[PDB]
Amino acid sequence: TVESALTRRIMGIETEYGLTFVDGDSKKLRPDEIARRMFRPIVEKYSSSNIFIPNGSRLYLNVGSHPEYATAECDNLTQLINFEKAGDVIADRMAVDAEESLAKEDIAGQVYLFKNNVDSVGNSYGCHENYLVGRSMPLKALGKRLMPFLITRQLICGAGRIHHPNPSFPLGYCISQRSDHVWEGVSSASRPIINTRDEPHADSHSYRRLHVIVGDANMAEPSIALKVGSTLLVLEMIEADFGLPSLELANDIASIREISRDATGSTLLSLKDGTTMTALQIQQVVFEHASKWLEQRPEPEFSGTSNTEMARVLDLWGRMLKAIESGDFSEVDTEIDWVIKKKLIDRFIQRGNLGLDDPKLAQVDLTYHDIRPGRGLFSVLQSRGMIKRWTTDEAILAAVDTAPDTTRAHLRGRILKAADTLGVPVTVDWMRHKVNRPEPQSVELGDPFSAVNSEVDQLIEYMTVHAGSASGTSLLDEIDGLLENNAEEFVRSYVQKGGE
């Protein structure tokens, strides 16, 4: 049943940003302090650190003290990438505003926001992936098919990091930031790699939400595209009963760190059946079946991820696997984050004959993730053209302002925008949107896919309706405030030459 596969699927990304405030040679502020500084306008306006912005994404201050951006629901991959990048734009704006406000205060520093998973001590913050799935779908299958792919997935989509041991694993370049910590998390008693149990944010009967913590945060758009897209393909294959060999492993986290250490992909995993496979082999099988699936795969009637796009995903996936087996990364050194980072690091090492333990390298490892244009290394690389682009800048810029038209987020956006224009208080959630005053009116959006709801239309109408003398009064006063007090001189002074 090829039709069963969800070609049009709701997906979202949760991004936790590393945050610091530094004068040269020191940190001016505590992370919690600078975080509070950044959210200061938001808290002033809405009286909450946690809010939903007009594009439909959720922006909030984490328990970890991290600024967190959760994308609006997206049914298309390029779309998802656009909004994830949009988060970077918004967050950076917030950072700059914090800098200026502190500067007025005589406090001098630069804000650094990192889209990365680790710190010098070895604490970890993650990028989280959310995929809509049918209620019917079983856990066992997920463990049988999805999990081996996810464990090995770090080879193709990894961001990379340098690992420094404290007085086990030696010093080396690692393809994945998250692997060690995910392992720590599962081993210590305790967060799952995969969870289908948490609230769907969709109608309970129809759907579940699949939560993935394994992935790295990615700077390069192709890396994101590969990471999410491959997962989508695997999910599609599982749904369609396309068949995939069951690769279930005796222990999921057994080889994960080791895989992280080995670029070759030669690491050996023990399957439940008692067979043994290299990680690269696992990737190879999944990829091959995906390749057949694409030919099998029917185009979505509405929206979704096009077969062309999936072809692109498979192209990159293939080139990357090819690179790992071959050992020649020249084809992909623009697309994949760990490869890119490694290339640059290699440049520094060669120029200085530097050791891996060299601080400059660690600095590069961190700053690559810095999201400020013209400061962060990734940005520099993009300016040179060393980085490949999946999507245009302008689409991202559109994404910061407006909600995805295809998904439910669109509706949310409308309300928010209307509210902001009207000046009426509103309370919004993924599923639930309501108008607080004068009389509370609540609409629940069960369907993530639907971009059209009648009740929402009535809600906005209500808001507009409730939206004489006081208005004009305040207005006249405001205009007086705006206008220069000596009017006569202002108008007299204005002089111009005739044009054309």
Under rule CB under 8 A, which residues in 14-53 are in contact with a second copy?
16, 18-20, 22, 24-27, 31
Q: Which of 203, 248, 401, 455 binds a second copy (CB under 8 A)?
A: 401
Quick check: 200 binds ligand ATP (CB under 6 A)? yes
Asked if 61 and 37 touch (Cβ cutoff 8 Å), the reply is: no
**Which CB, 12 or 148, lies closer to ligand ATP?**
12
Alpha-carbon gap, residue 179 to 191, rounded angstroms: 13
Alpha-carbon gap, residue 365 to 344, rounded angstroms: 10
| Interacting partner of 62 out of Mg ion, ligand ATP, a second copy, none (Cβ under 5 to 8 A depending on kind) | a second copy
Q: What is the DSSP letter of 124?
A: B
Asked if 267 and 276 touch (Cβ cutoff 8 Å), the reply is: no
**Which CB, 350 or 496, lies closer to Mg ion?**
496
Query: Residue 378 burial (CB < 10 Å; 0-12/13-18/19+)?
Result: buried
Alpha-carbon gap, residue 240 to 277, rounded angstroms: 25
Find tokens 């961001």 and name the residue: 159
Quick check: 198 binds ligand ATP (CB under 6 A)? yes
Q: Which of 53, 132, 290, 377 binds a second copy (CB under 8 A)?
A: 377
Which of these ranges, 78-86, 236-244, 306-314, 354-362, lies near a second copy under the rule CB under 8 A?
Answer: 354-362
Asked if 211 and 198 touch (Cβ cutoff 8 Å), the reply is: yes
Quick check: 70 binds ligand ATP (CB under 6 A)? yes
**Which CB, 65 or 307, lies closer to a second copy?**
65
Q: What are residue 51's DSSP bridge partners?
A: 59
Quick check: 202 binds ligand ATP (CB under 6 A)? yes
Quick check: 171 binds a second copy (CB under 8 A)? no
Q: Which of 5, 6, 7, 13 binds ligand ATP (CB under 6 A)?
A: 13
Q: Which of 10, 11, 14, 59 binds Mg ion (CB under 5 A)?
A: 14
Contact positions with ligand ATP (CB under 6 A) in 117-156:
130, 132
Q: Which of 430, 435, 443, 456 binds ligand ATP (CB under 6 A)?
A: 430
Q: What is the DSSP letter of 271?
A: B
Phi, psi of 107 (to 5 degrees): -90, 120
Asked if 149 and 234 touch (Cβ cutoff 8 Å), the reply is: yes
* 3 state DSSP class of 126: coil
**Which CB, 74 or 174, lies closer to ligand ATP?**
74
Query: Residue 186 burial (CB < 10 Å; 0-12/13-18/19+)?
Result: middle
Contact positions with ligand ATP (CB under 6 A) in 39-68:
58
Asked if 254 and 188 touch (Cβ cutoff 8 Å), the reply is: no
| DSSP string covering 302-322 | SSS--HHHHHHHHHHHHHHHH
| Interacting partner of 89 out of Mg ion, ligand ATP, a second copy, none (Cβ under 5 to 8 A depending on kind) | none
| Interacting partner of 198 out of Mg ion, a second copy, ligand ATP, none (Cβ under 5 to 8 A depending on kind) | ligand ATP
Which of these ranges, 9-17, 93-101, 338-346, 485-493, lies near ligand ATP under the rule CB under 6 A?
Answer: 9-17
User: What does the binding site for ligand ATP look like in residue numbers (CB under 6 A)?
Assistant: 10, 12-14, 58, 70-73, 130, 132, 198, 200-202, 209, 430, 448
